[PDB]
A = this chain, B = another copy of it.
Amino acid sequence: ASSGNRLILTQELHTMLQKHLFPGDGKEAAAILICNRYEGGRLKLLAKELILVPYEECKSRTSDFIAWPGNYLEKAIDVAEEKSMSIILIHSHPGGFLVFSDTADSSDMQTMQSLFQGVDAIHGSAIMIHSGEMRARLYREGKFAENVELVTVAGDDIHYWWDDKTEQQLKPIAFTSGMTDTFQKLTAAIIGVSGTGSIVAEQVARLGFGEILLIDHDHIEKKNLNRILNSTLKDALSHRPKVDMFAEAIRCIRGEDISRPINNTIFSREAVLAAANADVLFCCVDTYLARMIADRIASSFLIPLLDVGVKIPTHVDPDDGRKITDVTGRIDYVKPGGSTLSDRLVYTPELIYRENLNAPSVITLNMRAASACVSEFIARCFPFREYPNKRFTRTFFSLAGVEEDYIDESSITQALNTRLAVGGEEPLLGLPELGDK
């Protein structure tokens, strides 16, 4: 679950690619995906640019073959040369093809060697079927090496196309052992082992996730024994780090070294580069800085993001004295290429600036929010609602007003997303404080 490689496409790229590869005439088509890479605990290919080969530019197109010109390999190499990007050829299901110049044709093998000669990097060849599922093979030194373990698109719904898929195996439904089998192959990152984060982490561990990253610098103490799952008085009296405490708890619960404690703030190279390995991010730190870092990790490394927060404002009523003003929670799902936490004003530059220049809490509210947060991931991997998951991109609930509201992704304005799929380009996350010094 930790070292399997991945090819990640954005929903918007995948939709364009699927339309191009399946126009409706049942004939093969061709396209080229240019990808950045993350190479930490695993190889992750990050789809960045898409070149569609126009049908009229192809010498021929049939139900099981296509011939397209080699100038398109040159166009892909032009895009990839500077940053040694990975180049993935993609064809409609059957996948037979050749690349022709004026003088010579190149087989699939010859074309992959040609790609390597133009750009020293891992390249690949991928196939898509009409439904959109994708399989991919990687070429090292221009030669066939290994299949991609997982091709994934995290859109409104989240799709996992595994290399070991069974032919007559239907997708599992939510809350079943087939859900567990999926999660067992995935890595989850919990940013903040907090009131909400310890609960998200607990659910993630017991749901069967295969690797669980825990990122937090804080420690157990008497004041948070009312909230932090698995914490003990002995932990508090020694100020045991939260990540070490919870990592030990997970190893006892699951009986295996699946927890990865990161004793640091998310605003660190250690944390960012660990988190980049994850297949899903849960942000549970109640600071504007933390949510922005989580936001930028999600976009840069194409990781779906679930951000959760709760608030209990209070005020002094002239008659009764102090009063609970409201009891609220918020869940935000962010897909790569969809609206960001910034777009949603979960943070702003001014709020982060004022935060870095310079309130009751309760387990019941934390659990109410954390349960909804992990349920949102389940619903998007294994749809079970009567409405499209897109309708529930944002969730706002109030236990005092006893109301719950949902915001559709389509209602949210999107700014230009410059960091999408840039991976670990320095300065990391565009922040000099995280850059290689």
* CB-contact partner of A232 in B255, B368, B375, under 8 A: B255
* Contact status A175-B324, CB under 8 Å: yes
Give the residue name and chain of the B residue nearest to A384 (CB).
B324
A130 contacts which chain B residues (CB < 8 A)? none
Contacts A206-B227, A232-B252, A324-B174 given; indicate if A400 touches B371 (C-beta within 8 A).
no
* Contact status A367-B362, CB under 8 Å: no
* Contact status B254-A384, CB under 8 Å: no
One digit per residue, 1 when the CB lies within 8 angstroms of any chain B CB and 0 when it does not, for chain A 41-64 equals 000000000000000000000000
Within A350-395, the residues touching B (CB, 8 Å) are: 360-365, 367-368, 370-372, 374-375, 378-379, 384-387, 391-392
Binds B, one of A103-111, A341-349, A401-409: A401-409
A391 contacts which chain B residues (CB < 8 A)? 402
> Closest CB of chain B to A108's CB: distance in Å?
36
Asked whether any CB of chain B lies closer than 8 Å to the CB of A208, the reply is yes
Q: Which of A175, A368, A384 has the most CB of B within 10 A?
A: A175
* CB-contact partner of A367 in B314, B361, B370, under 8 A: B370
Asked whether any CB of chain B lies closer than 8 Å to the CB of A84, the reply is no
Contacts A368-B371, A402-B385 given; indicate if A173 touches B324 (C-beta within 8 A).
yes
* Contact status B384-A375, CB under 8 Å: no
Q: Once bound together, how far apart are the Cα atoms of A174 and B399, in whole Å? A: 12
Give the residue name and chain of the B residue nearest to A385 (CB).
B400
* Contact status A361-B175, CB under 8 Å: yes
* Contact status A206-B234, CB under 8 Å: no
* Contact status B321-A170, CB under 8 Å: yes
Q: Once bound together, how far apart are the Cα atoms of A378 and B202, in whole Å? A: 23
Asked whether any CB of chain B lies closer than 8 Å to the CB of A417, the reply is no
Give the residue name and chain of the B residue nearest to A323 (CB).
B173
Q: Once bound together, how far apart are the Cα atoms of A405 and B230, in whole Å? A: 33
Asked whether any CB of chain B lies closer than 8 Å to the CB of A233, the reply is yes
* CB-contact partner of A207 in B170, B226, B323, B386, under 8 A: B226
Contacts A173-B324, A375-B368 given; indicate if A252 touches B226 (C-beta within 8 A).
no
* Contact status A367-B226, CB under 8 Å: no
* Contact status B208-A234, CB under 8 Å: no
List 29 A-B residue pairs with CB atoms under 8 Å apart, sorted by A's residue number.
A173-B324, A174-B324, A175-B312, A175-B324, A175-B361, A180-B226, A199-B367, A202-B229, A203-B363, A206-B225, A206-B226, A206-B363, A207-B364, A230-B230, A232-B253, A232-B255, A233-B252, A233-B254, A324-B384, A327-B384, A364-B371, A364-B372, A364-B374, A364-B378, A365-B375, A367-B367, A368-B375, A385-B401, A391-B402
